[PDB]
Ligand binder design. Structure first.
Ligand SMILES: */C=C\C(=O)Nc1cc(Nc2nccc(-c3c[nH]c4ccccc34)n2)c(OC)cc1N(C)CCN(C)C
Ligand SMILES: */C=C\C(=O)Nc1cc(Nc2nccc(-c3c[nH]c4ccccc34)n2)c(OC)cc1N(C)CCN(C)C
Lengths: 285, 292
């Protein structure tokens, strides 16, 4: 339990290069130097934006034990924390980056097998989070990290210290966050993957998204998506939260589609060797 | 089978720094650059010193498929191969280096639990090779790599195509069996417990078979109780069938590893210790996710 979160000193790790930023702070590639050893181990470090208070630290640290306890192949685990003026969180470095940048850079030479399997894995990770009674609140393609092209993982859930175009209507109007609002964001996340990282509702300011949603408008059908896949997305954006699919169902339906991917995605152009190769070098779990 | 060995292009990996040299060539720290991606993945690359023909390459490929097939937490697997004028072999990079160098450089901070656990793991890897009917032929502390200080893996077997680590029958008649590997295992354990001392330091290699036939053996390491040295001595019996099996060495060093200060007497053993579960989880999540 308590063996899952390592407390680090300033002196045993260094930030070397900035990787990104989130609403919580900046993400760095760092190097961990085990005390008394001579190696330097790549890590990712999340520096919280504000210098935090001892009441926040006690809430942060005890919540860090929960984040350090998530045990699922498609959810990133927190590994360590360092409490300086600003709090630093240490997790595994994913050299491929987020799925959003990955799908933009491979814009039309990703096949249906990868796209559908990513949807299965994200649904698997979210369902686990639901099983642990954890609401993500910010599911998006930028918050799915690529461990290998064949293996993606959810990150950056937790902490209560806005992404309007991913949020369920009830989150926009009332700031209600449930697993069923995570389902809405999952639907948006699936659409991002199917459009290869297009910006949702391009041309509409965030301040007007709830008006168009109340009027019944939704993200359009991606060109490569059959109506089978689109109906699942549209069901994720129902106004009634309880009519939306559950993540456990999304696992099943998308697993079914992944067995005949060319039937459910019309992508123009549709080995153990390379999977075993990737697993040996990057992905032994 | 043929799916465990990736055939690489020259243009998808780069040698960046020389790590050391061996009998079959030079080993580099390198970078693997997957086609069409932007990432650079650290690897180890071994370039063969001598330049081989296409028919030599076919036999090399036949063994590279065997080397790519080893699936064990304590044996290094060949991952890929590139067929240049000199053949390049690609495997996982072990940032901690080889155990011989590690034990020399960290000798004043290595406690009994580490030494005994290394012995267990090397025997496990050798027992796997024996189960695969693969004779190592060159087991030594230099050919055991440190993935982490808690996890070592045997390397650089599968060569065929080091007098002071060899069984007598290997020196005299070039007989290599799993039981001659056991003798080399005994010498490797002696290397660890002496923190990387050179065996028979100052004795010319050509005269080693003489002293072995006359019954001389490596001395009891200062930190070893007689229990540990008796095992080493049983590894160096002239009758190969009388030496212990790797299966038995897993068991005996495991028993000792459950009470490590009873079997190794190290000055300072109490102020050193293995990592807490916290430090083990942290290590594995960052560097070592395999089963073990
Ligand atoms: C889409 C943004 C992105 O993630 N980019 C990115 C990511 C990583 N690796 C990584 N590893 C562990 C955690 C995280 C992480 C967690 N939360 C966030 C929030 C924002 C960004 C990253 C986050 N990321 C990279 O590793 C090298 C690189 C990378 N990029 C694309 C950096 C920019 N290039 C041009 C150098
Ligand atoms: C004792 C020699 C040694 O292995 N040194 C070493 C090794 C690695 N990593 C590594 N990874 C995969 C394969 C090999 C390997 C296989 N055969 C050989 C033969 C010679 C050298 C290496 C070989 N090695 C290192 O990773 C950074 C470093 C390293 N060194 C140079 C340790 C010396 N320093 C710590 C002073």
């Amino acid at each position: 339990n308590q063996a899952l979160l390592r407390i680090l000193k300033e002196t045993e790790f260094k930030k070397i290069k900035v990787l990104g930023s989130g609403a919580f702070g900046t993400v760095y590639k760092g190097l961990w130097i085990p005390e008394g050893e001579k190696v330097k181990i790549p890590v990712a470090i999340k520096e919280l934006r504000e210098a935090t208070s001892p009441k926040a630290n006690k809430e942060i640290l005890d919540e860090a034990y929960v984040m350090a306890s998530v045990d699922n192949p498609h959810v990133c685990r927190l590994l360590g924390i360092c409490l300086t003026s600003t709090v630093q969180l240490i997790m595994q470095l994913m050299p491929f980056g987020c799925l959003l940048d990955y799908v933009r850079e491979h814009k039309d030479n990703i096949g249906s097998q990868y796209l559908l399997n990513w949807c299965v894995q994200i649904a698997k990770g979210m369902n686990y989070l639901e099983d642990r009674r954890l609401v993500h609140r910010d599911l998006a393609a930028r918050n799915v990290l690529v461990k290998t092209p064949q293996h993606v993982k959810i990150t950056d859930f937790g902490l209560a210290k806005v992404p309007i175009k991913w949020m369920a209507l009830e989150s926009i109007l009332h700031r209600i966050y449930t697993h069923q609002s995570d389902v809405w964001s999952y639907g948006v996340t699936v659409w991002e993957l199917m459009t290869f990282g297009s910006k949702p509702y391009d041309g509409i300011p965030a301040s007007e998204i709830s008006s168009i949603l109340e009027k019944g408008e939704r993200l359009p059908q991606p060109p490569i998506c059959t109506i089978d896949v689109y109906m699942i997305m549209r069901k994720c954006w129902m106004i009634d939260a309880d009519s939306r699919p559950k993540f456990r169902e999304l696992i099943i339906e998308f697993s079914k589609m992944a067995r005949d991917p060319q039937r459910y995605l019309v992508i123009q152009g549709d080995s153990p060797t390379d999977s075993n190769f990737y697993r040996a070098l990057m992905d032994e779990e």
